[PDB]
Every structure is written in C-alpha cells, then in structure tokens.
Amino acid sequence: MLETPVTSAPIVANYLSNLPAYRTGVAPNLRGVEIGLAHGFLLAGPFIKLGPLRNVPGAAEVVGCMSAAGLVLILALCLSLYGNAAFQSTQDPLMSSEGWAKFAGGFTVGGLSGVAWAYVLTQV
Amino acid sequence: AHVVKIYDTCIGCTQCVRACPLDVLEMVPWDGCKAAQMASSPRTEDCVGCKRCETACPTDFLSVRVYLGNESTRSLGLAY
Amino acid sequence: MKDFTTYLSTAPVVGLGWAIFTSGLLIEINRFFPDPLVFSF
Amino acid sequence: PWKQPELDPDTPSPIFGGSTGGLLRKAQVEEFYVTTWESPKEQIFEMPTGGAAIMRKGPNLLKFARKEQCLALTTQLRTKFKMTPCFYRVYADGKVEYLHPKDGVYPEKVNAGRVGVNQNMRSIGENVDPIKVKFTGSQPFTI
Amino acid sequence: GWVTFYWHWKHLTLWQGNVSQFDESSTYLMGWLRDYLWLNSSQLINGYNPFGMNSLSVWAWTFLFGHLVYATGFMFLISWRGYWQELIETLVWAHEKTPLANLVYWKDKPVALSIVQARLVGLAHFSVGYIFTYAAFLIASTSGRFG
Amino acid sequence: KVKIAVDRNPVETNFEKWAKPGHFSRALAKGPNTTTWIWNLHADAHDFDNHTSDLEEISRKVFSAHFGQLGIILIWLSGMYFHGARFSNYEGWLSDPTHIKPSAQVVWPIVGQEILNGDVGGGFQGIQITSGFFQLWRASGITSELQLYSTAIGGLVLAAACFFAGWFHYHKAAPKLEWFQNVESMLNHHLAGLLGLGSLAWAGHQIHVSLPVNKLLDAGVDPKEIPLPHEFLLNQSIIADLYPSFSKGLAPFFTLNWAEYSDFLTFKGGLNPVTGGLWLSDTAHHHLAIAVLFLVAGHQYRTNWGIGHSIKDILESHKGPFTGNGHAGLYEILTTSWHAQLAINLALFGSLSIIVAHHMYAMPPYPYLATDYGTQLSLFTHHMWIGGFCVVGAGAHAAIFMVRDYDPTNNYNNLLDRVIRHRDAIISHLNWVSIFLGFHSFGLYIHNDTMSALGRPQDMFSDTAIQLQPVFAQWIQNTHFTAPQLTAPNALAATSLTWGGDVVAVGGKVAMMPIALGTSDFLVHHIHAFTIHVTVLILLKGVLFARSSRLIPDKANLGFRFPCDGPGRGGTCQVSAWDHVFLGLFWMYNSLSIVIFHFSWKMQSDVWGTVTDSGVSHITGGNFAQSANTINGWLRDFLWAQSSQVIQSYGSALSAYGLMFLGAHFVWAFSLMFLFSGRGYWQELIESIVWAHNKLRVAPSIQPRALSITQGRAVGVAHYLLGGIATTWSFFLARIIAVG
Amino acid sequence: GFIGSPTNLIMVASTGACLFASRFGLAPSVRKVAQPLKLADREVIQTTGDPAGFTATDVLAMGAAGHAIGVGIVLGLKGIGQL
Ligand code: CLA
Ligand code: CLA
Ligand code: CLA
Ligand code: CLA
Ligand SMILES: CC1=C(/C=C/C(C)=C\C=C/C(C)=C/C=C/C=C(C)/C=C/C=C(C)/C=C/C2=C(C)CCCC2(C)C)C(C)(C)CCC1
Ligand SMILES: CC1=C(C/C=C(\C)CCC[C@H](C)CCC[C@H](C)CCCC(C)C)C(=O)c2ccccc2C1=O
Ligand code: SF4
C-alpha cells in the first residue's frame, strides 16, 4: 500500500515488465530457457574461480562446469518438486501445474546450455 | 479451534468479555447468580487462546477456561 | 524520632545491623584467634 | 440490532497515507475484515497496523487482515471518543458476515435474546478424570 | 557430567601414575578447572593448527562443533516465541511485497515454533552439544597420550 | 520570557513517609500481602512517570535524583583521592614509574588475605590498581600526598554541598515546569558554561600548573625538589625560565601575536618520547580551542535578548519533499517526554564512551600510561562496556517513550509517523543485512576451521592463501600517516602512532607502534559489524513494534513491561519491548566481548611487548596474523594460551583474580536457571515449601511467591551479564598483570 | 594591539563595519528577524537614547562578532604570510 519512488519508478516498472518472469507474452518453455541460460552463466562463475582444483590449470574450468551442471540439475529437481507439490489443486499459464513443469524443463535445458556456453567462453 | 468452557461459578461481572481482544464471550440472562448474567462463548472459532479472559476472572480458580488444540488460521493470529 | 525509629525498624535496616554485627563478631574472633580448625579447648 | 446493517464499499476511507502492516495476500485468498464507524467530526486516531490517520466527518471505512486489529480499533474508538463502530468479515467469494454487534447491543449487555452455548453446568474441578474418558474422542471439559 | 568428570580425572591420574595429583588437586575447583579441564585439553586443541595437523583433528573439530550446538541450544532456550513470531511476520511481508520472488508461495503459512516445541529443540541442541563436547574431550585426552 | 520559576516548600521534610516503604504509588500504598510486592517496591522506585501524571513533580524528582547521583559520584571520587593520599605509593611511583606498579588498595590481615598485598615496589604492599589514577594525577601536576588529601576533602565538601543542593532544590525551592522546559537556555548554559568554561578552566590549569610540573618531571629532577604550583602561579621568574613567552606576561594574547605562545602551546602531534604520553602543551591548546569553540556555540539559541536561533523554528523549517512534515512535532516531543531525552542522552553518551575508549587506546593522554599495559586494557574494556550499556539503555528508554509518551495527535505525517509506517520494511532489510553479514563472516570462520581440519591451508581465508586484505582501512592508514606531510603541514608528526611511523618505547617496554591490518583483522571487524547490526535490529524491532504489531494489535494498552499475552496465536512469550531489550542485552554482551577479545589479542600480539636491541619482542609473538583466522585459534592461541596466569595465580597476590574468575563462572551458570524454566514450577515448589512451613507453624504472614516472568528474565540477564563481565575482567586483569 | 599596526587598523575597521551593518539593516540584530530577509520586531530592550533598534545586547553581540572576525582575519593573513 505504501508507494515508494523506487518501487513505482517508470524505469523500474519497464525493467521488470520485459523480464522473462513478468513478460506474459510467451510460452513457459522460452522463459525457462532464458532463466536457465542466465542463471547457469552466472552460477558457473564462482565455480571456475575458487573450487578445490583452482590451482590446477585446465581441469579447474571443467570441474567447475560439471559442478555448475550438477547445481543446475539440483535446482531443476527442486523446481519440478515445487511445481508438483504446489499447483496440484485448482490466466497465467506459468501458475499452472503442467505450465510449471514445462518451465522446469526449459530451466534445465537452459541451464545445461548456459553451462556449455560458459565452458566455451572460458576455453576461448 | 480452541475450546472455551464457562462454569456455573461465574458471577456475571462482564470482566472476561471486556478483557477479550477478539469478541468471543457474551452475556446471557441467568438465574444462578445475583447479577442474573452468565458468560457464553458463541464465537469460539475466533478465539486464539490468549487467556486474557482468565486474568480478569475475579472468582477463585476460574469460571472460564480456555483449552488449546487444533490451531487454524484464525486461531494462530495470522494476518497472512 | 519515632518515624526515624520505624524507618530503622524496617527489614533492610535491621538486616544491615545484623550483617555488621555478625561480620564484626566473626572478624574479631578470627583476628584474636588466628586460623583455628579443630576445637581443642 | 433490529435490522442488520449492510456495508457500503463506497464510504470514504479516513485520511491516511500508505500502510506497511496492511492487508497481505490473505486478503485476496481468504477473508478480510472491514470496520465502519460514523465520525461526527474530523480527528486523529491511531491505527493498530501502523501510525496515525485522520477520520472524515461522516461514514468511515477501514480494512484489516485480522479480527483482533478490528476489535482493538473498535475498543480504542469506544474508549477515546465513544464511537460505537462495527466490523464485517468478507470472504474471497464476497460473503459478508456480521461479527461484533451480533444483537446490536454489544456483548457487555445482555438484551435477553442470546442463548448461552458452550456452558458447562457443573462446577470446575468436578470434571471427570482423563482415564474415565479414554479412546472415545471426548474431552473431560466437553461433556 | 559430574560423575564422568570424576571417573575420567581419577582414571587418567591412575593411568599416568600421578594419583597424588588427583588426591591433592580434586579438593579445590581450581584443580578441577586447571589440572583436568585445562591440562588434559592441550592435545585436544592442537588437533589442527597453522603449524599442521595430528590424528586428533577430528576430535578438535567435533569439540568446537559441540560448543556450537551448545550455543544454539542457548539460542532456542533463552529467546521465546513473540520476537520470532513478529520477525516471521516481517519476513512474510518482505516475501509478499518483493518483485521477482512473490511469484512463488508457501503451501503452509510459516509460523514460529511452539513454546513446548522450542523447549524440546533447545533441549535437543543442548544435549547434543553436551554429548559431542564431552565425547570429543574424553577421547582426545585418553587416546592422544595413551594406546 | 525565560525566567526562574520556583515554588517555595512544596514538600515538607518529614520522616513519616520513610516508615511506609510503599508510598509513591497507590498500588503499593495498601501495604504488602505477597513477596512479589517487595520486588515491586524495588522495581518501581525510580518509575516517576507511573507515580504521578504531573510533569512538574516528575521533573523535580529528576533534578533531585541527578543531584543525588552527582553527590554519589563526588563521594566516590573523594574516596579515590583519599585512598591515593593514604593507602598508596604514589610518591614512590613518582620517583620511578617504570619499575613500581601503581597500588592504591591495601587489605587487612585477617584470614590470610594479606597475601593479596603484593610486592608492587617502592617499599609498599597492596593491590596493583588498573584505574590509571596515578597517571591522571601525574598529568594534573599532583606531587605530594597533601594535594591528594586536599582534593579528597574538597570532593567530600562538594559532595555534601550537592546532597544539600538536591534536598534544597526538591523540598525547599522546587523549580516549576516552565523552568525545565527552557531548552534553549539549558543548551546555551551547558555549551558555554558546563563544557566550555570547564574546558577553559582545565586549559588554564594545564598551562599554569600541569605543564611546568610535567616538564620538570620529564627533566628527571626530584619531585620533592619540584616547586609548588603556587610558586609558578605567583612568581613569574620560574615560569619565564621554563617558558620564555611567559616573560611577555599576557602581551601576545591581547596583541593577537599568538605565535609567540608556540613554545608552551605546541602542535607536535604524537607521543612524548620521555614518558610515552601525549604532549601536555598539545592538550593545553586543545582544551583552549575546545573552550573557544564551545563559548562560540553557546551563543546560538535565543533565550531573552531577541538574537539567537529558535529550536522549534529550525526543526519546522527543515522539511523535505520525500519526508512530508520534516521534524515537525519533535520539539513538542522532546520538551514534554523525559524518556525521549533519556534515549538521546544514553545513545550519545554510550557512543562517546566508545569513542573515548578507541581514542584513548590509540593516543594515551597521560604520562607513563602506555607502558602500563594493564591500565590501558582495563580502561578500554571499562569504557567499552559502559558505552554498550548506555546504548542499550537508549533503546530501552526509546521503547518506553514509544509505549508511554507517544501521542498520535501530534504525529500525523511527521518523521516518527513515517518511521512507524515503514517499520516492517526497516526490520526486514535489517534482518537481511544481519543474516548476510553473519553468513559472510561466521561462515568464513567455519570455512577456515574446516579447511584447516581438512588439511587444506591453501583453501583458507588467511594472510597467505586468499588475500582478503582491508584495502580501505590500509588506504586510510596510509593517508593519515601522510596527514602531517601535505594536508596538515603545521603538525610536527602524525596525529597517532597507529597509522604508521616508528616505535616509541619507555623503560624497555613499547609504548606505541604501528599496527598492521590483515585478513584476520578484516574478519573480526566484519564480525563486530555483524554483531552490532544484529543488536541494532533487536533493539529497533523492540522500539518500533512497542505499540502494535501484526501479531498483537493492542500492545500499547498492555504497557511497556509485560511478560506475555498468553499462549495464544501459537504463543506470545517475550513479545514486549522490555523483553526485546532483555534479549538484545545478551547480543550487546557478545558483541563487546568479541570486541575486547580482538583488542586484547591484537595489542598483545602486534602492539605490546618489550624492546630489545634486535627488535620488538611481543607478548604472544604476533600469532594474530596466523591464529585469529579460525575459531580454534581463539580457542587455543588466545583463550588457552592465555588464562594460564589466572589458573596458576593461587598462592600469589593474583589469587583473588582466580577466585573472582570462579565466582563469575558460578554466577554465569546460576543465571541460566532464571533464563530458562518459567514460573509455575517454582510456584508449585514454593507451595510445597509453604506446606512444609505450615506443618511446623512457621508460615510467614507475607505469602511467598515465585518471581515474575519479567522479574525472572531480569534476574537471569543481570546475573548472566555480571558473570560474563566479571569473568572477562578477572581473566584480562590476571593475564595482563602476570605477564605484562 | 599596537596603535597604528595593520592588525589594529583592520580589526577596528571590521568592528566598525559590523556596528554599521547592525545599525542599518544588513546584519541581523535584536529588531531584525526571519531567515531570508530582515523584518522589524519588538524593541525588547530600551535603547537608552539610541535611535532605532540598537540596545546594549546589540552592541555586545556585534562587538563580539567584530572581534571574532578580526582575529580570524589576522590569523588567516598571518598564516598566508600577509598582514
Ligand atoms: C552555565 C551554567 C550552568 C552550569 C555550569 C550547569 C551545570 C550542570 N547542570 Mg544545569 N542548567 C542551567 C545552567 C547551568 N547548569 C540552566 C540555566 C538551566 C535551566 C534552563 C539548567 C537546567 C539543568 C537541568 C534540568 C539539569 C542540569 C544539570 C546539570 C549538571 C549536569 C551534570 C554534569 O555535567 O555534571 C557536572 C558536575 C560538576 C562539574 C560538579 C560540580 C557541580 C557544581 C556544584 C555546579 C556549579 C554550577 C552551578 C550551575 C552554579 C549555580 C548554582 C549556584 C546557585 C550555587 C551540571 C552540574 C542536571 C542535574 O540536575 O545535575 C545535578 C539536570 O538534570 N541543568
Ligand atoms: C581559567 C583559566 C586561567 C586562569 C585562572 C589564569 C590565571 C592567571 N594566568 Mg593565565 N592563561 C590562560 C588561562 C588562565 N589564566 C590562557 C588560556 C592563556 C593563553 C595561553 C594564559 C596565558 C598566561 C600567561 C602568558 C601568563 C598568565 C598569567 C596568569 C596570572 C595573571 C592573572 C591576570 O592578570 O589576569 C587578569 C586577572 C584579573 C583582572 C583579576 C580578576 C579580578 C579580581 C579577582 C577581582 C577581585 C575583587 C574582589 C571583590 C576583591 C577581593 C576580595 C577580598 C577583599 C576578600 C593568573 C594566575 C601570567 C602570570 O602568571 O604572571 C603573573 C602570565 O605570565 N597566563
Ligand atoms: C542515564 C541513566 C538512566 C536513567 C536516569 C534511567 C532511568 C529509568 N530507567 Mg533506565 N536504563 C539505563 C539507564 C538509565 N535509566 C541503562 C543504561 C539501561 C540498560 C542496562 C536501562 C534499562 C532500563 C530498563 C530495562 C528499564 C529501565 C527503567 C527505568 C526507570 C526506573 C528505573 C528503576 O526503578 O530502577 C530501580 C533500580 C533497580 C531495579 C536496581 C537495578 C540493579 C541492577 C539490576 C543490578 C545492579 C548490579 C550492580 C552493578 C552490581 C551488584 C553486585 C552485587 C553483588 C551487589 C527510570 C525511568 C524501567 C522502567 O519502567 O522505565 C520507565 C525499565 O523497565 N531502564
Ligand atoms: C553459535 C550459535 C548461534 C548461531 C549460529 C545463531 C544463528 C542465528 N541467530 Mg542467534 N542467538 C544465539 C546463538 C546463535 N544464533 C544465542 C545464544 C542467543 C541468545 C541471546 C541468540 C539470539 C538471537 C536473536 C535475538 C536473533 C538471533 C538471530 C540469528 C540469525 C542471524 C543469522 C546470521 O547472521 O548468521 C547466519 C547463520 C549462521 C552463520 C549459522 C552458522 C552455521 C553455518 C556457518 C551455516 C551453514 C551450515 C552448513 C554449511 C549447512 C548445512 C546444511 C544441512 C546439512 C543442514 C541466525 C539464525 C537473529 C535473526 O533472527 O536473524 C537476523 C535475531 O534477531 N539470535
Ligand atoms: C556612535 C555613538 C557612540 C559611540 C559608541 C562606540 C564607539 C561604541 C563602541 C563599542 C565597542 C567598541 C564595543 C566592543 C565590544 C567588543 C567585544 C564584546 C568583543 C570581544 C569579546 C570577547 C570576550 C572576545 C573573545 C574572543 C577570544 C578571547 C578568543 C576567541 C575569539 C574571540 C574574539 C571571540 C557614542 C556613545 C559616543 C555616541 C552615540 C553613538
Ligand atoms: C529459581 C527461580 C525462581 C525462584 C526464586 C525465588 C523465589 C527468588 C528467591 C530470592 C531469595 C529469597 C534471595 C535471598 C537469598 C538469601 C536468603 C539471602 C542471603 C543469605 C546469606 C546472607 C546468609 C523464580 O521464581 C523464577 C521465576 C521466573 C523465571 C525463573 C525463575 C527461577 O529460576
Ligand atoms: S470474568 Fe469470570 S465471573 Fe466475570 S463474567 Fe467472565 S466468567 Fe463470569
């Protein structure tokens, strides 16, 4: 109820409007793909930096990439669990059960694609 | 929700209803007391079990008793 | 006088008086009988 | 009272800014409570969900998420200005329930029209032991 | 704890051969704190250090672990329900009124733990920390200098 | 407009109310019937807001109580000076301050406690004092015991005068409410007279008395052969020989040629190499400048002569667009509510005490103060704890003001109303900040401990593996080391030795030296910030939710100090603002304990020690760079490596520290039964004891009852704080006296 | 201090300028109020023969201000090597 200049800013409003979570202009698969790509690309960062094999060149990036892929898979499993255990009962298709399942599938597809993209960028 | 039970030792002093912060008790006509009033709980589903009515009871032991159990959204005092 | 006496008749004041009396008695006993342990007349 | 009043959503709210401890998502999922009163003049009162507001000269309508907040506002208005307000409960489907003045005379009075329920007719301490009521689902105080 | 302190100190002084140390040291609590809880804990605390590590590193780690669970028991026993319930209400508002995170929701409303539940959780943390701390100290002191 | 308003004899000096214990409140006026009355007698004694609703009587009681506390303080100071006059070796300490320990408390040989009178040196036996009173008296020019005797007698006389003043200003001539409400006159007189005039008087004492005595003491002459301060005051030849500018005789002051005063009003920032303290000329010019600034500031507010500033006009004028009524109703709040002023005073007093502790360990403003490591450690810890207690009492009395003296009529859209209106966002953001700080500090510590126990020193957050160096603190240290070089060229050296430079040592012991900052220092500083943030969150949640909340909407009607609201809504135990302060007291204790542990370890490892020809050999050998990064390092290299002096102190003069250590452990453990448990168990136990005494017909007429839940919480937190404080006190003092 | 010294001359000039400012608008005084401009106020203190709002506290305040400005100017000019 308490409106604030930062919450009601038009720049903030249009920045949150075109986000994949609040766009409401596409299938949940595309939003999940974008979410997985972005979050996997950022999550690969701390893993290629400070892992136990960070002193060993070459293998550090590979180990961090598989750790990021495992974290992405764990997040996808928790997303699927939340979708199955949250929307099991009675206009946005994301809030639906199978819509959230498709969102989770897009999320894991985007996560592995972003992990592979981060591996390519670190190799180059 | 919780269970509010009122016994015949009540003197109809209306202190429990004034101490109630959720409007659970009420005063009904009676003949077993000098004040001709008896406490009732027609809205026990809204009681949270705060035991504020028991503090205001002037009689020895308690003429009104609150027993907790089977908490709900109204009984847990949740605004969410 | 009697109001001050009843103030002195209050429980903390007489407790303080007992405290000084008992502490002084035990301290003077310990001072004039340095470190005893066993009753030997 | 003689006739149960009907709430009016078009009644003006008291002059107030933005509240942080206001209605949450439970207001659009479960029931929420609405308090109405009749202020003869404009004055400043303290809400239980935040700071202070100013009521308008006329009908005044406020919304809360808890019945305890509604009764706290009711007793504050009765003790400070003798306002005698009344709050309804509105569910998600729009069902309106009259809550505080069930007979319109407030629970401090009697009105000789309320049937006393949940009243044990025995003295406290005369209840049976829990061994007497076992594997039955009936508490010693529920008989 | 008292009976195990007595058993451990008496038996340790018997195995070391310095029974006179226990005889002249268990009289006063400085002896209990220094000759038992401080003298015999030298090998325990040196399990891991910047110098290196000996075989009692796991015992030092679980000793600090037990002290930590003791502190969490103090947390769940000292503070009571009203403060945590109000804090949970504020966190509920924070989760409700945020972008990019209010899309998710809880199936069950988060509430503070019950007072009986709080007593049980504090008791469990207290006893777990007690058991782990004394087991660590006992095993590290009896095995670090004997066999 | 501003004038003295005094009522003549409103209260008669009669002992008729001393006989009745419960008289200030009508609840206790009926007499006692249970034992919980007695505690209620000792709990509502100073609750003057509950005794009467009249602000004038409350203000008169506050004035009288302040006079009584000043009398008590002056009695304590006079007793300290008397103990320094008679049962002390101050004259022996003046001959050789680097070899005779300061002692001012002597015990009576009664039951073997005469072993506490240790060999402090100078042919004296007593307890080694850590108050630093010897260094304060040396900084004040005190030489003989006659001056200490005169100061003690004057302190007793002024204490009696203040005690009579309290009696007079309450019973005989009681000021009215309009007299107390003149905040502009109070501020003007306090800025100009209480602070500025006292600063000028102390500056004049330093110029005319303290500087020549300190200069002659640093010259190495006999203190008995030092001329008396009145010889410097009257005869100008000695003061001209010691300082040629005194030969001018007030000429440069009234001719604006103040540079001629540069010989005895210096700017040589740093430590005096002779004594390891601050330069007395620098302190003289400092107090003179402070006096000038405060006399300037004391002519700011308008009282009776047209010119000046109006506090209400200033507060109402400072209103922005994002705040609505900016500082609108605060003038009426602070002129009617005593508790708001109490919160402000306690917060600023505690913060200033913390500042005093930090800037006193940094610059020792006393001769031979830094050499005495125990005095510096005790003073830092004492001011630290007093500041913490004051800043938690600030939150307590702010919550009391929120419950009692808050009026929604005067706060519609002002700043307090908007703070209440977004308190939930405030508490949520503070909770997130506290959780993030605790994670990224304590989890870092746990990470270091695990990777140390896993045999991975290269995976640790240490000074050798992962360099999380404090680049901002190091940059500030480097900039302040170059402060006299470019930005303050008139200073001879740096303002303190902590920024950098060389090592200043006195008598072979290092007085001050540069302090290096590493990853462990960053970790402990962020830990301190986290603990302060959590305590701030607790106290702010207590203050802002004192009136109402989502859980309890009518918390204001329940009062400030209530135990609970029953087990309803899941349970409302410890929901009051008083319980919030009771919870935050432990967090303040934990924060300040970690702070003083960091101070003691850091100054023992990287500051204190001895100075040999090879270099500076510290007390602990500088292990803080390698041991402070893990919890086990604090467990072993700080708590177990130290505290061996406390446990081995038996049979020596330090054995009282070990006994006090054991008693403090006892009180800390005994507090937990009040912190845990409840009331019904002890009530039924008391019922059983009542049955036992009724069998023997020795049941008291006053019914024994268990302590209240609020009372039990208060007893628990008080015994817990006392036990922890005395444990740290005994351990710190024994360690710093035996090895220091 | 010394009669004829530059410091004496400029501090006498500063004190006289402060007094002249207080006499005619300019510097705020006992009879001058408000933050942006100066508005007439009550006489507060009898001026004892002085025309307009010029009382004893006015000359005390503005003599103090003139001495402060003069000593600040003197020490600032001495710091920069000037008069
Ligand atoms: C420049 C004048 C002056 C001075 C020096 C003081 C000094 C003081 N005031 Mg006060 N005050 C003044 C004017 C002054 N006041 C005016 C004009 C008002 C009315 C608007 C007040 C209203 C006021 C209140 C409401 C309170 C104080 C309090 C205090 C004390 C603060 C505690 C402290 O710092 O301890 C410093 C202590 C010392 C330096 C020790 C020596 C103290 C000596 C005896 C005081 C001498 C100064 C005295 C004002 C001279 C006039 C009194 C004379 C008739 C004998 C302190 C003694 C507090 C108090 O009650 O404390 C008792 C308090 O609550 N003041
Ligand atoms: C509060 C602080 C303080 C005090 C008390 C003093 C006091 C003193 N200083 Mg110091 N001084 C100070 C601050 C202070 N100064 C500061 C800040 C500086 C700046 C650097 C100096 C710099 C300085 C220098 C350089 C010298 C002094 C000197 C002096 C002495 C000369 C006094 C004088 O002529 O002044 C003016 C004093 C009066 C006008 C007297 C006051 C009026 C009297 C009390 C009236 C009494 C009337 C009474 C009713 C009648 C008597 C009653 C009886 C019959 C019962 C004096 C002992 C000089 C010195 O020691 O040589 C002697 C000296 O060389 N001082
Ligand atoms: C500037 C100083 C100052 C002043 C003037 C006040 C004034 C007041 N406070 Mg505040 N307070 C302060 C500082 C101050 N406080 C600080 C620093 C704290 C934090 C510790 C608090 C915490 C606090 C709370 C939590 C409460 C108050 C309350 C009160 C009121 C009554 C106090 C009373 O009756 O106590 C009577 C005196 C006692 C109860 C004695 C206390 C003794 C303590 C517990 C133990 C002392 C240990 C001692 C150091 C060592 C003993 C060892 C032993 C072996 C002898 C009064 C308005 C109460 C109130 O109702 O406010 C309106 C209240 O609930 N205050
Ligand atoms: C050492 C014991 C301990 C610990 C860990 C905590 C932890 C906490 N308390 Mg505290 N508390 C304690 C004792 C303790 N308390 C005691 C004794 C009291 C009584 C005075 C209190 C009183 C108290 C109050 C009054 C408040 C807290 C708050 C908090 C929270 C602050 C979060 C934070 O900054 O750290 C983050 C948490 C940690 C660093 C925990 C350390 C454990 C590791 C490092 C985390 C990861 C563990 C592991 C890797 C994951 C395992 C996964 C799976 C196997 C389980 C957090 C939940 C505040 C709150 O609610 O939040 C702001 C608050 O208001 N507590
Ligand atoms: C025109 C006229 C006239 C004249 C007048 C005159 C001429 C006057 C003057 C006056 C004056 C001429 C005054 C002055 C004053 C001054 C002052 C008052 C100042 C100061 C003071 C002080 C005290 C100071 C201080 C200080 C110091 C020391 C340090 C710091 C700074 C300062 C400076 C602040 C006649 C009457 C004939 C006639 C009519 C008109
Ligand atoms: C133990 C306990 C009690 C019982 C404690 C009581 C009744 C207080 C007892 C105080 C005693 C009477 C103080 C005096 C003790 C000695 C008799 C005095 C000194 C004697 C020597 C000088 C000889 C509570 O009432 C309680 C309430 C709420 C939370 C926790 C607790 C709690 O832990
Ligand atoms: S408070 Fe007790 S006696 Fe009074 S009306 Fe209620 S049940 Fe009856």
Cα–Cα distance for residue pair B51/F583, rounded to 1 Å: 24
Output DSSP code: residue F325: B
Cα–Cα distance for residue pair F210/F364, rounded to 1 Å: 16
Using DSSP bridges, classify how beta strands F118-119 and F125-128 pair: parallel, antiparallel or unpaired. Answer: antiparallel
F111 within ligand 2 shell (Cβ under 6 A): no
Q: Whose CA is nearest to atom 13 of ligand 5?
A: G63
Could you tell me if D140 and D130 are in contact, meaning their C-beta atoms sit under 8 angstroms apart? yes
- Centroid of ligand 6 to alpha carbon of F541 (angstroms): 31
Give SS3 for D96: strand
Residue F131 makes CB contacts below 8 A (sequence gap 6+) with: F80, F104, F375, F378, F379
Burial of F425 (0-12, 13-18, 19+ CB in 10 A): middle
Give φ, ψ of F253 to 5 degrees: -70, -45
Using DSSP bridges, classify how beta strands B26-29 and B37-40 pair: parallel, antiparallel or unpaired. Answer: antiparallel
B22 within ligand 7 shell (Cβ under 6 A): no
Chain E contact set for F565 (CB, 8 A): 82
Cα–Cα distance for residue pair F399/F546, rounded to 1 Å: 6
Q: What angle do CA D10, D15, D21 make, to 5 degrees?
A: 95
User: Buried (b) or exposed (e) across A6-28, using 16+ Cβ within 10 A?
Assistant: eeeeeeeeeeeeeebebeeeeeb
User: Residue F325 forms beta bridges with which residues?
Assistant: F414
Q: In angstroms, what is the C-alpha Rg of chain B?
A: 13
CB contact under 8 A, C10 and F21: yes
Nearest Cα residue to F457 out of A46, E49, A56: E49
Cα–Cα distance for residue pair F75/E71, rounded to 1 Å: 42
Nearest Cα residue to F507 out of F369, F379, F659: F369
Using a CB–CB cutoff of 8 Å, tell me whether A6 touches chain D: no
Pocket test for ligand 5, best of G11, G20, G67, G75 (most atoms within 8 A of CB): G67
- Centroid of ligand 6 to alpha carbon of F399 (angstroms): 28
CB contact under 8 A, A85 and E100: no
Token pair of F420, please? Answer: 């209440």
Which numbered atom of ligand 1 lies nearest the CA of F185? 20
Burial of D98 (0-12, 13-18, 19+ CB in 10 A): middle
Identify how the structure was determined: cryo-EM
Selected residues 11-70 of chain D with any CB under 8 Å from a CB in chain F: 17-21, 44-52, 54, 65-66, 68-69
Nearest Cα residue to E4 out of E32, E25, E28: E32
Q: Whose CA is nearest to atom 14 of ligand 4?
A: E72
Pocket test for ligand 3, best of F46, F345, F351 (most atoms within 8 A of CB): F46
CB contact under 8 A, C10 and F14: no
CB contact under 8 A, F570 and B71: yes
Using a CB–CB cutoff of 8 Å, tell me whether E100 touches chain A: yes
Could you tell me if E5 and E36 are in contact, meaning their C-beta atoms sit under 8 angstroms apart? yes
Cα–Cα distance for residue pair D106/D124, rounded to 1 Å: 28
Token pair of D47, please? Answer: 């809400």
Cα–Cα distance for residue pair F608/F372, rounded to 1 Å: 10
Could you tell me if F397 and F560 are in contact, meaning their C-beta atoms sit under 8 angstroms apart? no
Cα–Cα distance for residue pair F35/G60, rounded to 1 Å: 64
Output DSSP code: residue A94: G
CA of D73 vs chain F CAs: smallest distance (Å): 9
Q: Which domains does chain C have, with CATH numbers?
A: 1-41 (1.20.5.510)
CB contact under 8 A, G57 and F299: no
Q: Which of G2, G58, G61 sits opposite F255 (nearest CB)?
A: G2
Burial of F215 (0-12, 13-18, 19+ CB in 10 A): middle
Q: For residue F239, give the ligand nearest its CA.
A: 2
Cα–Cα distances (Å) from B14 to B27, B36, B50, B53, D64, in that order, read 7, 11, 17, 10, 27
Using a CB–CB cutoff of 8 Å, tell me whether E96 touches chain B: yes
Using a CB–CB cutoff of 8 Å, tell me whether B71 touches chain F: yes
Give SS3 for D58: strand
User: Residue F617 forms beta bridges with which residues?
Assistant: F610
Using a CB–CB cutoff of 8 Å, tell me whether F257 touches chain G: yes
- Centroid of ligand 7 to alpha carbon of F3 (angstroms): 56
At F199, the amino acid letter reads: S
Which numbered atom of ligand 4 lies nearest the CA of F430? 62
Cα–Cα distance for residue pair F91/F149, rounded to 1 Å: 13
Could you tell me if F208 and F140 are in contact, meaning their C-beta atoms sit under 8 angstroms apart? no
Token pair of E52, please? Answer: 């290196």
Please count the residues of chain B: 80
> Tokens 């409401």 — which residue?
A24
Using a CB–CB cutoff of 8 Å, tell me whether D3 touches chain B: no
Using a CB–CB cutoff of 8 Å, tell me whether D68 touches chain E: no
Neighbours of D114 (CB within 10 A): 19
Chain D contact set for B7 (CB, 8 A): 119-124
Which numbered atom of ligand 3 lies nearest the CA of F346? 1
B38 within ligand 7 shell (Cβ under 6 A): no
- Centroid of ligand 6 to alpha carbon of F580 (angstroms): 23
User: Which residue of C1, C2, C3, C23 to mutate against F (max F Cβ within 10 Å)?
Assistant: C3
At F524, the amino acid letter reads: V
Pocket of ligand 6 (CB under 6 A): F 673-674, 677-679, 682, 706-707, 709, 712
Could you tell me if A50 and F456 are in contact, meaning their C-beta atoms sit under 8 angstroms apart? no
Q: For residue F580, give the ligand nearest its CA.
A: 4
CB contact under 8 A, B73 and E109: yes
F397 within ligand 3 shell (Cβ under 6 A): yes
Could you tell me if A120 and A40 are in contact, meaning their C-beta atoms sit under 8 angstroms apart? no
Pocket of ligand 5 (CB under 6 A): F 292; G 15, 59-60, 63-64, 67-68, 71
Neighbours of F489 (CB within 10 A): 8
Which numbered atom of ligand 6 lies nearest the CA of F677? 30
Nearest Cα residue to F127 out of F693, F724, F653, F718: F653
User: Residue F174 forms beta bridges with which residues?
Assistant: F7
F182 within ligand 1 shell (Cβ under 6 A): yes
Could you tell me if F515 and F606 are in contact, meaning their C-beta atoms sit under 8 angstroms apart? yes
Longest dimension (CA), chain E: 71
Cα–Cα distances (Å) from E47 to B9, E41, F636, in that order, read 69, 10, 10
Nearest Cα residue to F507 out of F368, F366, F361, F360: F368
Chain D contact set for E96 (CB, 8 A): 24-25
Residue F130 makes CB contacts below 8 A (sequence gap 6+) with: F372, F374, F375, F377, F378, F379, F733, F736, F737
- Centroid of ligand 7 to alpha carbon of F567 (angstroms): 20
CB contact under 8 A, C4 and F18: yes
Using a CB–CB cutoff of 8 Å, tell me whether B78 touches chain E: yes
Q: Which of F453, F572, F647 sits opposite E60 (nearest CB)?
A: F453
Cα–Cα distance for residue pair F172/F509, rounded to 1 Å: 57
Chain D contact set for A1 (CB, 8 A): 18-20, 22-23
Chain E contact set for A22 (CB, 8 A): 99-100
Neighbours of chain B (3+ CB pairs under 8 A): D, E, F
CB contact under 8 A, F422 and A5: no
Give SS3 for F450: helix
Neighbours of chain F (3+ CB pairs under 8 A): A, B, C, D, E, G
Longest dimension (CA), chain D: 61
Pocket test for ligand 2, best of F250, F255, F256, F258 (most atoms within 8 A of CB): F250
CB contact under 8 A, B51 and F566: yes
What is the four-CA torsion angle of F724, F729, F730, F733, rounded to 10 degrees? 160
